[PDB]
Design a protein around this motif. Structure first.
Motif, PDB file in Angstrom:
ATOM      1  N   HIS B 160       0.825  -1.202   0.000  1.00 34.78           N
ATOM      2  CA  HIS B 160       0.000   0.000   0.000  1.00 34.78           C
ATOM      3  C   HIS B 160       0.861   1.255   0.000  1.00 34.78           C
ATOM      4  CE1 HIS B 160      -2.805   3.027   1.919  1.00 34.78           C
ATOM      5  NE2 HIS B 160      -3.560   2.551   0.946  1.00 34.78           N
ATOM      6  N   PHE B 161       2.076   1.127   0.517  1.00 36.06           N
ATOM      7  CA  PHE B 161       2.953   2.277   0.703  1.00 36.06           C
ATOM      8  C   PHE B 161       3.449   2.861  -0.614  1.00 36.06           C
ATOM      9  CE2 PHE B 161       7.127   4.211   1.743  1.00 36.06           C
ATOM     10  CZ  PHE B 161       6.669   5.188   2.604  1.00 36.06           C
ATOM     11  N   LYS B 162       3.685   4.170  -0.609  1.00 36.53           N
ATOM     12  CA  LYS B 162       4.251   4.863  -1.758  1.00 36.53           C
ATOM     13  C   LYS B 162       5.261   5.907  -1.296  1.00 36.53           C
ATOM     14  CE  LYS B 162       0.182   4.042  -4.595  1.00 36.53           C
ATOM     15  NZ  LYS B 162      -1.163   4.547  -4.984  1.00 36.53           N
ATOM     16  N   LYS B 163       6.483   5.803  -1.806  1.00 39.82           N
ATOM     17  CA  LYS B 163       7.515   6.791  -1.524  1.00 39.82           C
ATOM     18  C   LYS B 163       7.419   7.922  -2.541  1.00 39.82           C
ATOM     19  CE  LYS B 163      11.117   4.361  -4.162  1.00 39.82           C
ATOM     20  NZ  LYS B 163      10.140   3.417  -4.772  1.00 39.82           N
ATOM     21  N   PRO B 164       7.770   9.149  -2.128  1.00 38.29           N
ATOM     22  CA  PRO B 164       7.698  10.277  -3.060  1.00 38.29           C
ATOM     23  C   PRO B 164       8.653  10.101  -4.236  1.00 38.29           C
ATOM     24  CG  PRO B 164       8.920  10.882  -1.088  1.00 38.29           C
ATOM     25  CD  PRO B 164       8.289   9.550  -0.809  1.00 38.29           C
ATOM     26  N   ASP B 165       8.184  10.398  -5.446  1.00 40.25           N
ATOM     27  CA  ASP B 165       9.040  10.419  -6.628  1.00 40.25           C
ATOM     28  C   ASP B 165      10.205  11.369  -6.360  1.00 40.25           C
ATOM     29  OD1 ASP B 165      10.197  10.390  -9.157  1.00 40.25           O
ATOM     30  OD2 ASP B 165       8.287  10.545 -10.224  1.00 40.25           O
ATOM     31  N   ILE B 166      11.365  11.071  -6.936  1.00 38.40           N
ATOM     32  CA  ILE B 166      12.559  11.905  -6.804  1.00 38.40           C
ATOM     33  C   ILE B 166      13.348  11.801  -8.099  1.00 38.40           C
ATOM     34  CG2 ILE B 166      12.771  11.639  -4.268  1.00 38.40           C
ATOM     35  CD1 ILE B 166      15.387   9.874  -6.198  1.00 38.40           C
ATOM     36  N   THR B 167      14.215  12.762  -8.393  1.00 35.51           N
ATOM     37  CA  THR B 167      15.181  12.469  -9.457  1.00 35.51           C
ATOM     38  C   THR B 167      16.555  12.980  -9.028  1.00 35.51           C
ATOM     39  OG1 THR B 167      15.643  12.542 -11.870  1.00 35.51           O
ATOM     40  CG2 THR B 167      14.757  14.514 -10.922  1.00 35.51           C
ATOM     41  N   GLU B 272      -3.631 -18.682  -0.477  1.00 35.81           N
ATOM     42  CA  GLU B 272      -4.245 -18.289  -1.749  1.00 35.81           C
ATOM     43  C   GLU B 272      -5.360 -17.266  -1.512  1.00 35.81           C
ATOM     44  OE1 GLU B 272      -5.567 -21.799  -3.737  1.00 35.81           O
ATOM     45  OE2 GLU B 272      -3.703 -22.067  -4.866  1.00 35.81           O
ATOM     46  N   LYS B 273      -6.339 -17.674  -0.712  1.00 38.28           N
ATOM     47  CA  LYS B 273      -7.446 -16.814  -0.318  1.00 38.28           C
ATOM     48  C   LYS B 273      -6.952 -15.490   0.253  1.00 38.28           C
ATOM     49  CE  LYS B 273      -9.580 -15.980   4.025  1.00 38.28           C
ATOM     50  NZ  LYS B 273      -9.369 -16.313   5.468  1.00 38.28           N
ATOM     51  N   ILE B 274      -6.027 -15.559   1.209  1.00 41.02           N
ATOM     52  CA  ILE B 274      -5.539 -14.343   1.862  1.00 41.02           C
ATOM     53  C   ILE B 274      -4.857 -13.398   0.867  1.00 41.02           C
ATOM     54  CG2 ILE B 274      -3.868 -13.420   3.517  1.00 41.02           C
ATOM     55  CD1 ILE B 274      -4.490 -15.609   5.403  1.00 41.02           C
ATOM     56  N   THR B 275      -4.008 -13.947   0.003  1.00 39.26           N
ATOM     57  CA  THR B 275      -3.328 -13.134  -1.005  1.00 39.26           C
ATOM     58  C   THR B 275      -4.314 -12.446  -1.956  1.00 39.26           C
ATOM     59  OG1 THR B 275      -1.347 -14.531  -0.966  1.00 39.26           O
ATOM     60  CG2 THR B 275      -1.664 -13.112  -2.882  1.00 39.26           C
ATOM     61  N   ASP B 276      -5.242 -13.224  -2.511  1.00 40.07           N
ATOM     62  CA  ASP B 276      -6.254 -12.665  -3.407  1.00 40.07           C
ATOM     63  C   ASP B 276      -7.043 -11.560  -2.706  1.00 40.07           C
ATOM     64  OD1 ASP B 276      -5.396 -14.487  -5.288  1.00 40.07           O
ATOM     65  OD2 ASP B 276      -7.077 -15.875  -4.994  1.00 40.07           O
ATOM     66  N   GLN B 277      -7.337 -11.783  -1.429  1.00 38.05           N
ATOM     67  CA  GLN B 277      -8.049 -10.803  -0.619  1.00 38.05           C
ATOM     68  C   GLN B 277      -7.261  -9.504  -0.499  1.00 38.05           C
ATOM     69  OE1 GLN B 277      -9.252 -12.252   3.223  1.00 38.05           O
ATOM     70  NE2 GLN B 277     -10.007 -10.255   3.924  1.00 38.05           N
ATOM     71  N   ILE B 278      -5.965  -9.626  -0.223  1.00 40.09           N
ATOM     72  CA  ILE B 278      -5.101  -8.459  -0.076  1.00 40.09           C
ATOM     73  C   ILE B 278      -5.066  -7.647  -1.360  1.00 40.09           C
ATOM     74  CG2 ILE B 278      -2.742  -7.644   0.238  1.00 40.09           C
ATOM     75  CD1 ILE B 278      -2.232  -9.845   2.170  1.00 40.09           C
ATOM     76  N   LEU B 279      -4.809  -8.330  -2.473  1.00 37.98           N
ATOM     77  CA  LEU B 279      -4.766  -7.673  -3.777  1.00 37.98           C
ATOM     78  C   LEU B 279      -6.081  -6.955  -4.095  1.00 37.98           C
ATOM     79  CD1 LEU B 279      -2.878 -10.470  -5.714  1.00 37.98           C
ATOM     80  CD2 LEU B 279      -1.979  -8.254  -4.990  1.00 37.98           C
ATOM     81  N   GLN B 280      -7.190  -7.663  -3.896  1.00 34.91           N
ATOM     82  CA  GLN B 280      -8.520  -7.103  -4.128  1.00 34.91           C
ATOM     83  C   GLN B 280      -8.750  -5.828  -3.316  1.00 34.91           C
ATOM     84  OE1 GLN B 280     -10.927  -7.843  -6.236  1.00 34.91           O
ATOM     85  NE2 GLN B 280     -12.540  -6.527  -5.392  1.00 34.91           N
ATOM     86  N   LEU B 281      -8.534  -5.921  -2.006  1.00 31.75           N
ATOM     87  CA  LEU B 281      -8.747  -4.785  -1.111  1.00 31.75           C
ATOM     88  C   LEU B 281      -7.859  -3.599  -1.481  1.00 31.75           C
ATOM     89  CD1 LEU B 281      -9.107  -6.643   2.313  1.00 31.75           C
ATOM     90  CD2 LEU B 281     -10.902  -5.466   1.022  1.00 31.75           C
ATOM     91  N   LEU B 282      -6.620  -3.895  -1.868  1.00 29.51           N
ATOM     92  CA  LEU B 282      -5.699  -2.869  -2.347  1.00 29.51           C
ATOM     93  C   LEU B 282      -6.277  -2.116  -3.542  1.00 29.51           C
ATOM     94  CD1 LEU B 282      -2.144  -4.497  -2.142  1.00 29.51           C
ATOM     95  CD2 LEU B 282      -2.841  -2.324  -1.122  1.00 29.51           C
ATOM     96  N   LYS B 283      -6.669  -2.871  -4.565  1.00 34.10           N
ATOM     97  CA  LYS B 283      -7.185  -2.261  -5.784  1.00 34.10           C
ATOM     98  C   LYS B 283      -8.451  -1.448  -5.512  1.00 34.10           C
ATOM     99  CE  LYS B 283      -3.678  -3.903  -7.367  1.00 34.10           C
ATOM    100  NZ  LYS B 283      -2.944  -3.856  -8.661  1.00 34.10           N
TER     101      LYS B 283
END
Ligand code: NA
Ligand code: NA
Ligand code: NA
Ligand SMILES: [Zn+2]
Lengths: 243, 299, 223, 282, 256, 210
Positions: B160-167, B272-283
Motif C-alpha cells: 500500500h505504501f508509496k515513496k515520493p518520486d525523486i530524481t 491463496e485466499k488471503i493473497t487474493d483478498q489483499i490484492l482485491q482490497l488494495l485495488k
RNA sequence: CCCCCGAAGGGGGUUUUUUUUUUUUA
C-alpha cells in the motif's frame, strides 16, 4: 558457480548425495567442569557441550515447584570461521532463536517434572564451524545430557539436508549451505516424529517432503552412531569399575 | 511474574472439546479467522483484524546512507515490540523474550530476507544515498495469531505504501511533495503469508514418544485460550508461487513428518485466499482514492 | 593423516591459502577418498560390481570400448589419457569425428582446463556428456579415489603435484586394464617424466604420427 | 553383569513389573530413560545411571556446608540436586535437653551456624522433591574443626556401619556418603570408640565453636596432607574408598618421603594398582 | 576451594604460614601442579592450544592472523579473553584482557619485527582465549596456553602481497610467561590452589620474557576476606623466586 | 541509542615536586567526597571522589562489606575502558586491605572517581595518576565516616606506582607497567617520600577539615 | 500428609573468492 553435484554423482568434498560427514563423539570429557559433557566432531564442526545440573537455582526466583528449569547457552567463538569475527555473537537474535529452539526442543524430551526446584544449565562452545551447525548442536546436547544421567524419553538426532535443483544433498557443509537452501531436522529416536523442523530460505513446496525423507533416514544413522559410542563408553566403564 | 493463571477445569474442558472436534469460537480445526484489512489516510498505514486479535502497521521511509558492505542495496528494518496494551502478561519491550525473539525472527525471515521487498530498488545513488524503509508493527489486542497478523499487516502495508518520486543530478537529489509529482510504490517481488498450526497432545507423553496411532491434534490460527494450552507450534510461510518461504517448528511436541507436510499444503490453500483478498482490497482502495479525486476536481 | 570410514570411505584435510586481493586467508576443507570410482570400461569386470547408483538411482554407463583403436607395438589396446595443455591446444581435434574415439579425462585435468578456459571446459564437458558409439569421453575422479590420490609434498608447486596425479592415474590405469591388456597413453607436451620405476608418454604430434589416419589430421594442430 | 541399556530402549514387554527410576512405560512396554544398567529387585524394575549426583536417603551420614541462613532453618550444600534443610529444632543447643524453645536463639542463629560453616549431619527424612531434611542431635554430629576438607564422587564412597574412623598418625576421617570428606586431628571423643567419660561428653559444651585446637603438631598436619592426597589418588583410580583402603593407601604411599610427590599421575596410579594387587593377593 | 569456614581458613593459614610452609597437598613453595597441553588441534586457526590443570581448570587458545597496514593499526597483537560464566562486561575479564594485552604489546612484549611483511603491511595476531573452567586466578593458565599456542603457530608465507598456497612458515618469537604468586604471611607460593588463594594475604603477578623479569608486575588480591599489607622483602622474594624457577617452566613448555 | 540523543548517524566526529590542594565534604548527595588538585611544572591534574555507602546489596547475606570502585573519564575520553577497569581492580585490592570491612556486613560501599582534568603541557599517564586516585579515595572514605585501619598512601616513579600504609613499613599496592627498567629500591624510596608527604598533607587536611 | 507421644500436644510445603524498425513465415 561450480559442480555442486557432478553428473557422476559426486560433491566438492567427494561425498555422494546420501552420505553423512565424518561423525565422531566423546563422552565425559570434562568431569571436573560439569555433571555431563560431550565433545563432538561432525565434519569440520567441533563443539564442546557442558551440562551442569540438576542443581540448586542461583536465584530464589527462576525456581519452579513442579518442574526443572532448562537453560541453554550457545557460544559461537570468534575463531569458528575462517575469517575471525570482530563482533561477539552472544546477544544476536539468531543465537537467541537457536537457544530458545534447543530449550523448547528438550523441554518435551527431558523429564523436567522429576527434577522440581532445580536448574539444568546447558553450556555450549562451538570451537569450529563448517555448516549444518544446528543439528550438531542438537547432537552435542543429546550426548551431554545422557552423560549427565538426566532422564529423557529418547535420543534426538540433528541433521541438515540441502536442496540442489532436483536432488537433495545430505549433511551439507559450509560451501553447500551457501548457494543452496537447507532444511534442519531434529528427529526423535527412531520415529518419524520431528522435534525440530527448520527452513530459513525459499524451497519449492512440492519438493519439500522428499527432502525430509532422506533427512530422517540420515538422522537415524546419526542416532545409531551416538548410541554406538555410549554403549562402548558404558561397556568400558562398567567393566573396569568392577573389581 | 505477570502470569496468566489457567485452571485445571479450563484446560481439561478445552482439551476435551478438541477431542470432540470442538473449538470455543465455533471454527473447524482447519479454519483460519476472517481477516479484516483496513487502509486509511497516508499510504503504508494498515489495520489488520483477526477475530478479536487487532494489530496495526505503519510503513515509513527516509533518506540514508547505504551500508559499507552492500553498495547497491537500500535499508529495510521491521519492528515488533509488544506492549501491555495487548495484555498485561506482556512486559514493556522485552525484545530478549522467547516468543518475542521467535516472532521477530519469523517475520524477518518471512519478509526481510525472502526478498519480498526490492532493496536494490531503494538505492538512490550507490555511494552516498539510499531509501530506508521501515515497518513498525503495533500490537493492539491479543487473542493469538500475532505472527500471521503481523505478516499480513507488514505485507499489505508495504504494498500500500508509496515513496515520493525523486530524481537525481549527480551530487544532489530532488525530492517532491505530492503536488509536485505523484508518489511511486515499492518493488514487491512476492507476497509471503504465514500460517500458524497449534499442536495438542490428548494422551500422555509416553504415547507421543513411543506410541502408535498418533492422536496429536492440530488446529489453525489458535486463539489466546488455545495458544496458552498448546504443546506445540509450527509457523509456515508460503507464497502463490508454491514456495515454502520459511518453516519454523522450534521444538515443542514432536509431530509426524507427514502431518507437517499436510499442514504446509492446507496452509497454501489458505494463503491463496488471503493473497487474493489483499490484492482485491488494495485495488478497491486505489479505485476509491481515484474516484475521490474525481469528486474533488468538480463540485 | 587420513581416517578410514564405514564403507570403503576415507577422509583427509585439504589445507591451503587463498589470496584474495590484499589479503591472506587459510582455507581448510575435508577431502573424502572412495573405493567405488568406476573406470567406465566395457572390458572391466570388477568395477561394475563395486559401483553404486546416483541420486536418481542410476548405475553409471560403462562406455569405453572393450576393443579400442589399436596401434603398432609397444602400443596395443590403448586408451588416451589427456593433459590440460593438449586439451587446450587440440580441443578442436578432440571433436574430430575420426580420431580420439576412446579418451579418459581425469578430474584434475577437467579442473585445470576449467580454471584456465571455461568455454573449452564446456566443450570438453559436452564431449563427455554426448558420448556414444562414435565417440567416447569419460571423466575419472582421480582426486576422490584413494588408489590414485597423491598428496602434495612440501616446497613443491601445484604443477608437479597435478602432473604426478595424472601420472598416478595413468599408472593405476595400466595396472587395472592390463589383465585385458588395455594400455594407456598419456598425451602431453610438458616433459613430465624423468625415467622412474612405467607409462607410455607421447607428445601430441607423436601420438598423431602413430595414428593410421595421420595424413588426414596432421595439419589440424597449432604450430 | 547386567544388561546395558540406553534411553528409549525397550527393557521388557511384560507388564507385571513395578517401575522404578530410569524407566517410563506405555501399556505393557517398558522403556529406559537413561544410559545405565538394568536392575531387578523383587518386582521393582529400574535402570541405574552410570553417573549422577548424590541422591540423599533416609539415615545417610553426610558432610555439608552452610549455604544459607533463613527462617528457623539452615540451607546446607550436600552436593545433591537440591540444598538440604536443617531445621532449628533439629539441632542441639549448647547444653542439656533442658533449654526450651526461645525466640532469642532464633535471633542469634548465626552464632551457632553461619554461612560457610562445615558440619557433619544425618539425613532424618526426605521431602517430596527428594531433598534432604537434616538433624545433628547426636553428639557425633556438629560443626567440624581441626582439619581439612576434600571431596570425591559420592559413588566412590563404599558404605559400612560407620563412616567416622580412627586412622594411624592420630587422624580421624569423616567419610560423608555424599562424597564430602573431612580430615581432622583425633579428639578425645574420637578416641572413645572403644567397644571421666561423662565429663568428656559434657566438655564439648561448645559444639559451635569456630576455634581450632591450639596445639596441632606438624606431624598431624603432614599426615593430613598425605591422607588427603592418597584419598584423591584412590578417587583418580576410581577405586572405592574404604577405611582399610585408606590406611593401605597411606602406608603404601609412605614409599614417597615427600607428600607432594603423591599429586603426580603415575604415583596415583601406582598407589591404586598397589592396593588392588595387594587386595587380590590376600 | 571457595567459601571455606573460618575454622578451615585458620587451619590452612596456620599450615601455610608455619616455617616451613605446609601446603594442603604437600607441595613445595615453588612446585607446580600437574598439567597437560595439546596443540595444533584447530586446523582453521594459525595456532591452537589447550591446557588442562589437575584441579579441573581448563583453557583453550586460538591464534589467528590478518594483514594490516602498520600505519593504520599500530597494535599488531590483540588479546581477547572469554571466561565462561562471566559476561564480557565483567571487571575481572577486562582486567585480565588489559593485563595480557600489555604483556604481549608489540612495543616490547614481543618482537614486532618478526611480524613485518612489507614496509606497509604485516600480520596482526589475534589471540583468542576461552577459559572453559577456572577455580583460581587463571592468568598463569592463560599465559601458558598462549605460550604453547604461539610456539606452535604457523603463518602463510609471503612471495599488494601475495602468498604461497601450500607452504607456511613457523612464527618465530619468544612469547612471555605470566606468573601468579600467593603471599601468605612471610611465605611465597607458586601456583596457588583455590583453598590456598582463599586465605592468602596477597598476591603477585609477575611477567617474564627472554629469561628476564619483565613488566607488567602487579599486586593482586586473591580474595576479599584476608587481604593484608606485606613487607617489600616479600616482593623481592617473589621476584627472585620467579627468576629462579622460571627457566625450568620455559624449558618444560618449549620441549616438544 | 534509544535512551540518548546522539544525533545523526551519518555524522562523523571531528578529527584534527608537585603542589597539592585537598578538600573534603563538598558534595551533598553522597556520604563522602574529596577534591584533589595537583600542580607540577608543565603538568596539571584535578580529580574528584564520591563515596556512596554503606548501602544495601542485592543478593545473599554477606559477612562483610563489599567495595566497588568506578573510574569515570573526565572531559577527554583519555583512557581505555579495560585499563580503567584494571586500575579499578587494583584500587579495590588496596582498599580491601585498608577498609575495616568486618564492620559492614550485608552492605556495599560504592566509590566514584571522576577524572575531571588531566592536562600536562609536556611534549601511559595512568601511573602518575594512580597515587592521586588513592589519596582522593582515602580522603573521601575518611570523610564518609567509613572506617580505615590506616591512611592509604602512594607514590609514582619511573612507571612504578607503590602504595603504602603504616608509615611506609608495609605495602598495600604495587603497580609496574613498562615505564622503563630501573632497580626497585630507589623507586621504592621516591614513592615512599611521595607517600609520606601525601600522608602528612592528608592528615593535615583531615585536621583543618572534617 | 510425614515426622514424637503414647491414646493430644508440638514442627513441616521447602517465599569463503576451493586455487537496421515492425509483422506473418521452410
Ligand atoms: Na533421533
Ligand atoms: Na544414509
Ligand atoms: Na557486604
Ligand atoms: Zn575397472
Amino acid at each position: 558457480r561450480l559442480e555442486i553435484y557432478s553428473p557422476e554423482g559426486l560433491r566438492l568434498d567427494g561425498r555422494r548425495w546420501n552420505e553423512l560427514r565424518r561423525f565422531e563423539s566423546s563422552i565425559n570429557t570434562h568431569p571436573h567442569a560439569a555433571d555431563g559433557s560431550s565433545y563432538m566432531e561432525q565434519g569440520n564442526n567441533k563443539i564442546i557441550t557442558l551440562v551442569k545440573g540438576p542443581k540448586e537455582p542461583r536465584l530464589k526466583s527462576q525456581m519452579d515447584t513442579s518442574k526443572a528449569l532448562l537453560n541453554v547457552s550457545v557460544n559461537i567463538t570468534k575463531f569458528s570461521k575462517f575469517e575471525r569475527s570482530k563482533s561477539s555473537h552472544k546477544n544476536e537474535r539468531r543465537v537467541l532463536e537457536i537457544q530458545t529452539s534447543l530449550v523448547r526442543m528438550f523441554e518435551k524430551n527431558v523429564m523436567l517434572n522429576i527434577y522440581p526446584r532445580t536448574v539444568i544449565d546447558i553450556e555450549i562452545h562451538v570451537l569450529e564451524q563448517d555448516g549444518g551447525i544446528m543439528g550438531s548442536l542438537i547432537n552435542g546436547i543429546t550426548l551431554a545430557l545422557i552423560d549427565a544421567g538426566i532422564s529423557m524419553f529418547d535420543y534426538i538426532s540433528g541433521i541438515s539436508v540441502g536442496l540442489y535443483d532436483t536432488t537433495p544433498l545430505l549433511d551439507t557443509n559450509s560451501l553447500e549451505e551457501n548457494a543452496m537452501s537447507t532444511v534442519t531436522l531434529g528427529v526423535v529416536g527412531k520415529s518419524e516424529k520431528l522435534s525440530l523442523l527448520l527452513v530459513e530460505d525459499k524451497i519449492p513446496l512440492d519438493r519439500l517432503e522428499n527432502v525430509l525423507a532422506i533427512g530422517i533416514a540420515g538422522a537415524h544413522r546419526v542416532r545409531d552412531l551416538m548410541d554406538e559410542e555410549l554403549r562402548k563408553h558404558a561397556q568400558k566403564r562398567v567393566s573396569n569399575a568392577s573389581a | 511474574a505477570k502470569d496468566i493463571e489457567i485452571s485445571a477445569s479450563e484446560s481439561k474442558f478445552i482439551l476435551e472439546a478438541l477431542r470432540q472436534n470442538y473449538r470455543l469460537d465455533g471454527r473447524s480445526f482447519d479454519q483460519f479467522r476472517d481477516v479484516e484489512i483496513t487502509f486509511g489516510k497516508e499510504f503504508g498505514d494498515v489495520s489488520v483484524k483477526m477475530g478479536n486479535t487487532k494489530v496495526h502497521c505503519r510503513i515509513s521511509c527516509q533518506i540514508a546512507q547505504p551500508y559499507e558492505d552492500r553498495p547497491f542495496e537500500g535499508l529495510f528494518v521491521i519492528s515488533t515490540e509488544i506492549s501491555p496494551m495487548a495484555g498485561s502478561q506482556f512486559e514493556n519491550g522485552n525484545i530478549t523474550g522467547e516468543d518475542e525473539v521467535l516472532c521477530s525472527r519469523i517475520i524477518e525471515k518471512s519478509v526481510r530476507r525472502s526478498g519480498a521487498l526490492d532493496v536494490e530498488g531503494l538505492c538512490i545513488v550507490a555511494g552516498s544515498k539510499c531509501w530506508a524503509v521501515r515497518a513498525d508493527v503495533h500490537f493492539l489486542d491479543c487473542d493469538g495469531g500475532f505472527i500471521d497478523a503481523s505478516c499480513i499487516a507488514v505485507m499489505a502495508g508495504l504494498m500500500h505504501f508509496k515513496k515520493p518520486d525523486i530524481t537525481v543530478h549527480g551530487e544532489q537529489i530532488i525530492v517532491h511533495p505530492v503536488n509536485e509529482r505523484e508518489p511511486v510504490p515499492l518493488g514487491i517481488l512476492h507476497i509471503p503469508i504465514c500460517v500458524t498450526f497449534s499442536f495438542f497432545n490428548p494422551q500422555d507423553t509416553e504415547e507421543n514418544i513411543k506410541g502408535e496411532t498418533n492422536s496429536e491434534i492440530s488446529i489453525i490460527d489458535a486463539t489466546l485460550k488455545e495458544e496458552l494450552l498448546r504443546d506445540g507450534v509450527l509457523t509456515v510461510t508460503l507464497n502463490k508461487n508454491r514456495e515454502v518461504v520459511q518453516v519454523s517448528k522450534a521444538g515443542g511436541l514432536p509431530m509426524d513428518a507427514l502431518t507437517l507436510m499436510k499442514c504446509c499444503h492446507e496452509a497454501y490453500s489458505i494463503i491463496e485466499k488471503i493473497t487474493d483478498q489483499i490484492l482485491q482490497l488494495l485495488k478497491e482502495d486505489s479505485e476509491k482514492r481515484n474516484k475521490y479525486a474525481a469528486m474533488l476536481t468538480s463540485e | 593423516r587420513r581416517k578410514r570410514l564405514a564403507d570403503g570411505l576415507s577422509v583427509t584435510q585439504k589445507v591451503f591459502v587463498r589470496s584474495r586481493n590484499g589479503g591472506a586467508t587459510k582455507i581448510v576443507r575435508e577431502h573424502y577418498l572412495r573405493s567405488d570410482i568406476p573406470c567406465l570400461s566395457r572390458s572391466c569386470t570388477k568395477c561394475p560390481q563395486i559401483v553404486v547408483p546416483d541420486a536418481q538411482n542410476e548405475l553409471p554407463k560403462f562406455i569405453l570400448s572393450d576393443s579400442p583403436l589399436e596401434l603398432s607395438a609397444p602400443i596395443g589396446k590403448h586408451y588416451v589419457v589427456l593433459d590440460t595443455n593438449v586439451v587446450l591446444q587440440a580441443i578442436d581435434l578432440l571433436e574430430n569425428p575420426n580420431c580420439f574415439f576412446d579418451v579418459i579425462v581425469p578430474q584434475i585435468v577437467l579442473d585445470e582446463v576449467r580454471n584456465k578456459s571455461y568455454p573449452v571446459y564446456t566443450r570438453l564437458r559436452t564431449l563427455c556428456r554426448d558420448s556414444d558409439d562414435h565417440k567416447r569421453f569419460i571423466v575419472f575422479h582421480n582426486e576422490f579415489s584413494e588408489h590414485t590420490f597423491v598428496e602434495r609434498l612440501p616446497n613443491e608447486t601445484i604443477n608437479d603435484r597435478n602432473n604426478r596425479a595424472i601420472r598416478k592415474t595413468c599408472q593405476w590405469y595400466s595396472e587395472h586394464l592390463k589383465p585385458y591388456d588395455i594400455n594407456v597413453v598419456l598425451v602431453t607436451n610438458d616433459r613430465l617424466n624423468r625415467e622412474a620405476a612405467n607409462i607410455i608418454t607421447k607428445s601430441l604430434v607423436q601420438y598423431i604420427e602413430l595414428l593410421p589416419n595421420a595424413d588426414d589430421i596432421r595439419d589440424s594442430i597449432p604450430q | 553383569d547386567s544388561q546395558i541399556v540406553t534411553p528409549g530402549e525397550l527393557v521388557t514387554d511384560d507388564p507385571i513389573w513395578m517401575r522404578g527410576h530410569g524407566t517410563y512405560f506405555l501399556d505393557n512396554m517398558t522403556y529406559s530413560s537413561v544410559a545405565g544398567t538394568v536392575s531387578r529387585v523383587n518386582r521393582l524394575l529400574s535402570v541405574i545411571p552410570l553417573k549422577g549426583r548424590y541422591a540423599p536417603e533416609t539415615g545417610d551420614h553426610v558432610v555439608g556446608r552452610i549455604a544459607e541462613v533463613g527462617n528457623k532453618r539452615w540451607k546446607v550444600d550436600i552436593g545433591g540436586k537440591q540444598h538440604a534443610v536443617l531445621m532449628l529444632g533439629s539441632v542441639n543447643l549448647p547444653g542439656g535437653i533442658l533449654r526450651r524453645k526461645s525466640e532469642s536463639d532464633e535471633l542469634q542463629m548465626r552464632s551457632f551456624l553461619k554461612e560457610g560453616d562445615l558440619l557433619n549431619a544425618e539425613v532424618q527424612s526426605l521431602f517430596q522433591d527428594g531433598s534432604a531434611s537434616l538433624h545433628t542431635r547426636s553428639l557425633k554430629y556438629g560443626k567440624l574443626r581441626n582439619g581439612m576438607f576434600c571431596q570425591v564422587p559420592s559413588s566412590l564412597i563404599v558404605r559400612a556401619k560407620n563412616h567416622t574412623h580412627n586412622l594411624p598418625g592420630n587422624i580421624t576421617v569423616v567419610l560423608g556418603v555424599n562424597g564430602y570428606i573431612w580430615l581432622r586431628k583425633t579428639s578425645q571423643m574420637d578416641l572413645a570408640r572403644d567397644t571421666i567419660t561423662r565429663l568428656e561428653e559434657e566438655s564439648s559444651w561448645q559444639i559451635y565453636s569456630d576455634e581450632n585446637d591450639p596445639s596441632i603438631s606438624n606431624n598431624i598436619r603432614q599426615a593430613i596432607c598425605r591422607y588427603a592426597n592418597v584419598i584423591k589418588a584412590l578417587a583418580f583410580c576410581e577405586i572405592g574408598i574404604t577405611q582399610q583402603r585408606i590406611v593401605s593407601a597411606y602406608e603404601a604411599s609412605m614409599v614417597y618421603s615427600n607428600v607432594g610427590e603423591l599429586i603426580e599421575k603415575n604415583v596415583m596410579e601406582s598407589i591404586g594398582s598397589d592396593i588392588l594387587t595387594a587386595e587380590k593377593m590376600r | 576451594h571457595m567459601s571455606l569456614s573460618v575454622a578451615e581458613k585458620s587451619y590452612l593459614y596456620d599450615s601455610l604460614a608455619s616455617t616451613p610452609s605446609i601446603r594442603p597437598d604437600g607441595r613445595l613453595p615453588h612446585q607446580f601442579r600437574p598439567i597437560e597441553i595439546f596443540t595444533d588441534f584447530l586446523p582453521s586457526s594459525n595456532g591452537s592450544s589447550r591446557i588442562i590443570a589437575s584441579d579441573g581448570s581448563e583453557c583453550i587458545v586460538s591464534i589467528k592472523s590478518k594483514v594490516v597496514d602498520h600505519h593504520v593499526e599500530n597494535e599488531l597483537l590483540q588479546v581477547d579473553v572469554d571466561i565462561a560464566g562471566q559476561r564480557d562486561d565483567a571487571l575481572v575479564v577486562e582486567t585480565i584482557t588489559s593485563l595480557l594485552n600489555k604483556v604481549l604489546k608489540s612495543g616490547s612484549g614481543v618482537d614486532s619485527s618478526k611480524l613485518q611483511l612489507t614496509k606497509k603491511y604485516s600480520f596482526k595476531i589475534f589471540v583468542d582465549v576461552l577459559v572453559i573452567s577456572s577455580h583460581s586466578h587463571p592468568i598463569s593458565l592463560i599465559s601458558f596456553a598462549i605460550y604453547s599456542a604461539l610456539n606452535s603457530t604457523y603463518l602463510p608465507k609471503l612471495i599488494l602481497p601475495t602468498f604461497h598456497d601450500y607452504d607456511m612458515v613457523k612464527l618465530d618469537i619468544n612469547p612471555p610467561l605470566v606468573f601468579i604468586l600467593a603471599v601468605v604471611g612471610n611465605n611465597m607460593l607458586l601456583d596457588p590452589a583455590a583453598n590456598e588463594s582463599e586465605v592468602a594475604n596477597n598476591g603477585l603477578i609477575i611477567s617474564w620474557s627472554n629469561g628476564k623479569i619483565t613488566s607488567p608486575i602487579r599486586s593482586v588480591a586473591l580474595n576479599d576476606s584476608n587481604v593484608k599489607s606485606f613487607k617489600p622483602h616479600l616482593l623481592k622474594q617473589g621476584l627472585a623466586m620467579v627468576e629462579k624457577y622460571a627457566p625450568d617452566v620455559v624449558r618444560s613448555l618449549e620441549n616438544l | 541509542d534509544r535512551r540518548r540523543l546522539l544525533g545523526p548517524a551519518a555524522a562523523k566526529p571531528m578529527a584534527f615536586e608537585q603542589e597539592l590542594s585537598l578538600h573534603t565534604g563538598f558534595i551533598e548527595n553522597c556520604n563522602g567526597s574529596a577534591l584533589v588538585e595537583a600542580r607540577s611544572l608543565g603538568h596539571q591534574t584535578s580529580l574528584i571522589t564520591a563515596v556512596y555507602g554503606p548501602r544495601s546489596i542485592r543478593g545473599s547475606f554477606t559477612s562483610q562489606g563489599t567495595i566497588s570502585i568506578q573510574l569515570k573519564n573526565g572531559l577527554l575520553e583519555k583512557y581505555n575502558t579495560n585499563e580503567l577497569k584494571e586500575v579499578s581492580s587494583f584500587l579495590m585490592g588496596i582498599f580491601n586491605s585498608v577498609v575495616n570491612l568486618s564492620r559492614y556486613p550485608k552492605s556495599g560501599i560504592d566509590i566514584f572517581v571522576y577524572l575531571t582534568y588531566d592536562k600536562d603541557l609536556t611534549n601511559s599517564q595512568i601511573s602518575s595518576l594512580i597515587p592521586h586516585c588513592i589519596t582522593s579515595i582515602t580522603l573521601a572514605l575518611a570523610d564518609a565516616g567509613i572506617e580505615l585501619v590506616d591512611m592509604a598512601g602512594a607514590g609514582e616513579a619511573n612507571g612504578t606506582v607503590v602504595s603504602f600504609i603504616k608509615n611506609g613499613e608495609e605495602i598495600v599496592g604495587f603497580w609496574k607497567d613498562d615505564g622503563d627498567d630501573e632497580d626497585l629500591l630507589e623507586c621504592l624510596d621516591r614513592c615512599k617520600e611521595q607517600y609520606n608527604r601525601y600522608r602528612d598533607l592528608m592528615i593535615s587536611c583531615l585536621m583543618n577539615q572534617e
